[PDB]
């Protein structure tokens, strides 16, 4: 009744720049294309911070409420739970972690995003798992696009 998996993305941008985007729990729309708004009252970037995101129109859900569980700036780990929303995901926990990597002399970042979530009522484990994996993979591909563009702009 639970399911889990892990997605990865090789990003052609330095860890420090990628982390500077990923750690913004209060502004996931910096790179998540399915978020239209994000409101965080109270303390913004501390364990326990709560965010309410509005999803972009035409999606099968419209809102999510999420809590920051882990914000490790030394190890570059961002841990988040979903606690409310009108999507079908219950007890969803997310962990994204970044690791520097060097491919052919070129330094970059390996992003690894893992999840755990309940298998919804009517849906199956494969159904839920495959759906979430595609969404995370899309989000990690947007992260690469955003940070690789920022890397390029920094090159003047």
Which residue ranges are tagged as binding site?
32, 61-66, 88-94, 113
Nearer to ligand L6V (CB atom), residue 116 or residue 153: 116
Pick between residue 110 and residue 138 the one whose CB is nearest to ligand L6V.
138
Are 115 and 93 contacting, i.e. CB atoms less than 8 angstroms apart?
yes
C-beta closer to ligand L6V: residue 93 or 151: 93
Which stretch of DSSP H or E encloses residue 90? none
The answer to whether 128 contacts ligand L6V (rule: CB under 6 A) is: no
Continuous H helices in the chain: 15-22, 125-154
Distance CA 137, CA 125 (A): 18
Report how far apart the first and last C-alpha atoms of the chain are (Å, whole number): 50
Residue 22 makes contact with ligand L6V by CB under 6 A? no
Residue selected from 9, 25, 64, 111 as contacting ligand L6V according to rule CB under 6 A:
64
């Amino acid at each position: 009744s639970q399911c889990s998996s892990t997605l990865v993305k090789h990003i052609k941008a330095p860890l420090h720049l990628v982390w500077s985007i990923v750690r913004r729990f209060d502004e996931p729309q910096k790179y998540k294309p399915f978020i239209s708004r994000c409101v965080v009252q109270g303390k913004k970037l501390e364990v326990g911070s709560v965010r309410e995101v509005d999803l972009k129109s035409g999606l099968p859900a419209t809102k999510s409420t999420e809590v920051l569980e882990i914000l490790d700036d030394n190890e570059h780990i961002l841990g988040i739970r979903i606690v409310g929303g009108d999507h079908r995901l219950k007890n969803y926990s997310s962990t994204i972690s970044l690791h520097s990597e060097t491919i052919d002399g070129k330094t970059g970042t390996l992003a690894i995003e893992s999840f755990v979530v309940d298998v919804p009522e009517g849906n199956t484990k494969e159904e839920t798992c495959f759906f979430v994996e595609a969404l995370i993979q899309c989000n990690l591909n947007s992260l690469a696009d955003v940070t690789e563009r920022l890397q390029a702009e920094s090159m003047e």
